[PDB]
Each structure stands twice: as C-alpha cells, then as structure tokens.
Symmetry: C3
Subunit: 268 residues, 3 copies
C-alpha cells in the first residue's frame, strides 16, 4: 500500500485535485507545518496535500518549515512525496510552460536547517550524513516522465535545479554564472526539501514548471501569469501519475531507502 504526499508550490496547490477531502491540522517536534494537511484520494490511492507557502501564500521560501512539513507527511504514513514548484529557465530549449522532471540540484541557500538530526530532538538522535548522489527517486521520476508523454506534454526528462536563498531574484551576473556551473532551472524551495525527504526514507520527486527565462526578464507578475496559464498541466500529470504509482510494488525501493537513511546516522 502506498500513500502520496503532495506539496503544492506557488499557484500549484489546488485542493480540488483530491476527492473525499478532510482538513487536518497537525504538530511536529520541529514545529507546525505550513498549513493544514488535506487528506483525500485520487482513484483508490490515499494522498495528503500540503501548501508549501500556506493557503494564502504568506510564507517566504527561507522561512518555510521544511522540517515540520516533511515530518508531518512521514507521520501520516506517506511513502512518496511528489511536489510542484515554479522555476526560471536557464536554457533556451526549456520554454516557459515546460515541465522539467529534475534529477539534480546545486545549493545556493544559506540560512536553512537541512537535517532532522540537529542534536536537540529526541526523535532524531546522532549525526546524520545523508548521501545526495541521486537526490530524487528514479522510479518515481520514470513514471512522471512516461505519464507526461502519454498526455503529450512538453516535458524534459532531467535537469539541474539551482536553489537560491531569495526572496530576491538573481542578478544578471549570477544568472550567467549559474549557466556555466551547469544549472538548467532555478528556484527557491527545492533545497532542503529534497534533503529532508531522503533522511525520512521517502521517495521524492519534483514537477518543476518553467515560468520565465530569469534574466540571462523575470518578475512576480510574469511568474504568476505563466502559472495561471499552465497550472492544469501539473494537475493533470499528478492525477494520471498517482494511480500508476499505486499499481506497482514499492517494498524493495522503500527498503533500500530506509537502509540508506538508517546507516547514515552516527550514534554516540
């Protein structure tokens, strides 16, 4: 049995995607999640939706409680966590409106807790050095890619996301530099969300939606406009992907993830 946690980004957190909805506020050892958890289903698969920035988008990327969000979904019994996020394109071929099933990231954040094992919580004892060679679940990404193809959507099979601290957008010099580093898209929320999901032994995948070409220009109005015009794509992709995830066996994949997380912890 699988359970899909869904974290919705800016303008990509529609509750109506779930059938048989029930609101549920929870608490965690790391604090309160961005907003209430929305329990429901897509066909016969159980899901838990959560708005990353709150339903009214009042939380900036740097202040999102990534620890509480991931811990809450883990506590609900989620086996997978598929998220949505807007991003700027750093490559001509990645056009606004395109979907990118990212497989790598480059961290440019500075003031964000990236581990549950901070030495101050009894629920997470020891020092954890989680491997990040392959940050996103290959199997989950594969289903997303094939479903996008079945839907006939413009979708890139891989891509490197550079996550900046924000809330400001990048300068032109920074934008050029990121391209030379090998970054393909840019956002403000992938890190540490992907890191914490790995520590939790959860299958994590991200649906990145290009909304602009950054400035190599971007603005909040441009981002919001493109999201409004393309939100249906992420919704259709999730609706079609999830029942497919639920029809396959994940015990082995989840076992390997649990082992990796478990053996990354150094106890006294």
């Amino acid at each position: 049995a699988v359970k899909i946690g869904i974290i919705g980004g800016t303008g990509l957190d529609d509750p109506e995607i779930l059938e048989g909805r029930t609101e549920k506020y929870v608490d965690t050892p790391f604090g309160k999640p961005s907003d209430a958890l929305i329990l429901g289903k897509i066909k016969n698969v159980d899901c838990v939706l959560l708005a990353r920035h709150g339903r009214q988008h009042t939380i900036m990327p740097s202040k999102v409680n990534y620890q509480a969000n991931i811990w809450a979904l883990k506590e609900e019994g989620c086996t997978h966590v598929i998220v949505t996020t807007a991003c700027g394109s750093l490559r001509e071929e990645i056009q606004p409106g395109d979907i990118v099933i990212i497989d790598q990231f480059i961290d440019r954040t500075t003031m964000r807790p990236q581990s549950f094992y901070d030495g101050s919580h009894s629920c997470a004892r020891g020092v954890c050095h989680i491997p990040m060679a392959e940050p996103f679940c290959p199997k989950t990404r594969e289903v997303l890619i094939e479903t996008a193809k079945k839907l006939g959507l413009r979708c890139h099979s891989k891509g490197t996301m550079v996550t900046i601290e924000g809330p400001r957008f990048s300068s032109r010099a920074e934008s050029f530099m990121f391209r030379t580093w090998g970054a393909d898209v840019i956002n403000m929320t992938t890190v540490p969300e992907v890191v914490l999901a790995k520590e939790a032994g959860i299958c994590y995948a991200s649906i990145a939606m290009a909304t602009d070409y950054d400035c190599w220009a971007v603005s909040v109005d441009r981002v919001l406009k493109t999201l409004k015009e393309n939100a249906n794509k992420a919704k259709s992709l999730l609706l079609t992907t999830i029942p497919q995830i639920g029809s396959t066996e994940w015990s082995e994949t989840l076992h390997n993830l649990k082992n990796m997380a478990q053996f990354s912890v150094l106890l006294p």
Copy 2:
C-alpha cells in the same frame, strides 16, 4: 526635487563634504542605523550622509544594519542613494586608485537579511521578490561616469562586484575562482545594501575604489593606505556629480522604480 543619500564606506565617509551640516539620530522599525544622519547640502541640493561602519568604524560588514540604514534614508525623503566602498581588483586593468562604477554583483554573503518583508514588520507586509536584472540605476551611473571623465579620473564604466561575507579576506583559491565566475572587483558590503535600496524604490549607485589586487597581497594596512591616498577622488566626484543630478528630471525614473517595487509584493 531630489534628495541624495550618501553612504560612506571605510575611509570614504568625510562629513566636511556637506555644507550647512546638522546631526540627527533616528530610529527605524528595523533598529538603529550605523550612526547619526548628517543633513546638509552640496550647492542647492539636499543630502543625507551616513557612515556605513559608524564614525569610529566599529561595525563589521556582516553586522551592519543594512535594513535600518536604507529605511532611515528612505524616511528622510531620499530619492537617490550614492555610496562609496573600497574593493580589491580581480583584473589587471583595474589598478589600485581606480574608480569602478559597478553595474552587477555576485552574492557570496551568508548571514544577512536581504528584504524588508520578513513577515515580522507591519510596515512591510507580504512576500517580496524584487527583480535584480539591473541592480544599479543606469541614469545615476551615467552621470557618475561622465563626471569622472570631466574630472579626468581613471574610471571603469562597468564591473561585477562579488560581495563576500568576511570579515576575513579571500583565500588564493577563492580569488582565482571568482575571476572564472566573471567577477571584476571584490568587497564585503554591496549585498544586501543594493537589494534593499531597490525594494525601497530608490535610485542606487556605487563608487567602488580599488585599493589592492586581492591575492591572485591584500592587508588592512594596504587598504587603509590606498584609501588615504585616493579619498579626494570620491569626494570630488560626489561634489561635482550631485548638482548635475539635481538639474535633471527624475519623476519618470522614480515612478518606474516605485511600480517595480510595488508589484514585487505578494499579499495574502
């Protein structure tokens, strides 16, 4: 009517530049500014001078209250903010003593608040994603460049400033790396000063004075020596530039800046 805020850097914060001076200590929602505001004039133009590190230079770059400084100048009615800063040269052609009217930056800071919209101040509500494609005012930079030419000063028309966290200087490996990234000069204070000025809808420009070639070596004594030998240049440039700024119309430029800042804010 224009009003020029002037933020003086290390050894480039001479109060005598202003005529008819009056000291004024102020407070802001973000705390106290580095020191008192010095009100005065250059010809018929009103100005407000502020020492970035305090008159006795007791504040390190990472602890400067950039938010309070910019907010105080904005509250005084400043339409422009022209600053001075020492920097290391990362290019052979930029010689110590040279002035660089920088047009871009690369952020290497880590523990600095970069927005007024942090969710804890009623004076700045919402999430702000300010555009940084063109961080510095083109029109203000243009006047500085032409005035430098009229004065016959060695001045570079553009340049990318990499702002490091400090207080330590860069290692040789870091110095080499910054050159490959496309950085031309290096300092410790441009970011987030330039970011906050943009959020405030103020025309911001920076007079960077090269004092050394970093280590691709630099020392505090070398920096102080070069500043003492060349401080008169920044003073003469400001004295000649400001009356020129005051003789032109800025309502349209300021309107466009206000619009950009206003529409960068996401309200609940």
Copy 3:
C-alpha cells in the same frame, strides 16, 4: 620552546598517541571546547590533543565550537596546531587512503562564526580582516611532506579543500561543479578552523585523509571503513613529524604570524 595542539577528526583522534597523559577540562570566552584537553608528550615535545567532534562523536560539523577549540589551544600555549580530517577525493590521482597536505581552501559553509572579533567579547576588540592568501603554515607543511616521504607514504604535496556546510554529502551536480572550480578534496571542517588559527597567530597545518571519491559513491559506512584501515598513517606521521618540529627554531615564523594578526585589527 614549541607546543603542538592536535585536533583529531572523525576516527583520527586517538589519545594513546600521547605519552604521560592528563585530562583537563577548560572554559573560554566563546564557550566550552568540544571535549577535554589531553596534555602529554611525544618524545620531549609538549602536546595538547582535542577531539573535534567530542570523544563520542556527538557534534555535527556545523555545530562544532571552532572559536572555543582554537582559543583553548592558544590559551594552553600552543605555537602550532596540526589537525586530521577525513575528506572525499575530487581527483583520480588522489586515491582513498592517500594523505593530502592541503595548502588552500574554498569556503562553502554558511552558518559559522569565522572570527574572534565579533564585537561582543572584551578579549577580542575591534574589526579583524585576517589575510588568507596563504592559509596554512608553509614551514609546518614542509616538515609534514618530508616526514611522509621518509615513511614512504602516498602523500600529495598540495591541494585545495572545499569545505561544505553539511551534514549532508554533496549532490552529483555539486561534485562536478567543485571540480571545475579547482577543488581537489572535500570536507566539512577546515573552514573556519584554519581562519581562527590564523587570527590566533598559530602555525596551522592539516593532514587530510582521502576516504572516498565523493560521487563524481560515498556513505558514512564507506568513510568509517577507510578511516579504520588507514588511521595508523596519520598517527605515524604525527609521531615522527612533531619531534622534528621541536628541533628547529620558530621564533621568527611566530613573530611574523603575530604581526600579521595584530595589524589586521581595526580599533575605534
């Protein structure tokens, strides 16, 4: 007379290396050191050993009190501080088990105090801008290199260490990027340890032990395994190097270090 401070890293902090041991808990203006100081000798040379992560390895890299550790050793009268650290190799020629006498670093840390002069301690007044062109002591590194040769150990004479914040390991995209930046090895503790030692006017050198090839894959178990298999190398190197350090004159080298540190401080 010399006194060698030794900071032992993960699995490279064996107390038995010292003869005539005596445990000593101390306090500093910056807080408590990672663990108690172990006083003792190697031949006729006085030494002070300190486990970076605590004897039971309960402190993550980002939470190590680098300020207290360096201050404690300085207060004990240490003239030199030679440390050990595990690291990942970013170059084919640097094989796991190899020693690298690093000479440069690239900072990728974000939430770490890098100076004693933070404006809140009477023991360290003013603003300090310490030079980092040559972060490690050349003379100390030279003795380590020659001793490694006399022992017939695979040892690299130089290398650039990129210090990441951690506790997570790097992503593959980050690993590739670090190689293009010119990094040779990667760890989580060199910065700011090397910076604070310089401010303290102490001769600092690092014995980096490659334990894996990062992911250009690494895991805690792989790291621990390689350290267990090669720990004897660092121990033998220290035992043979230290008596050699004690047989030479260091007054001039220490005087030059004291001058550099002293003149890096800007007083009110």
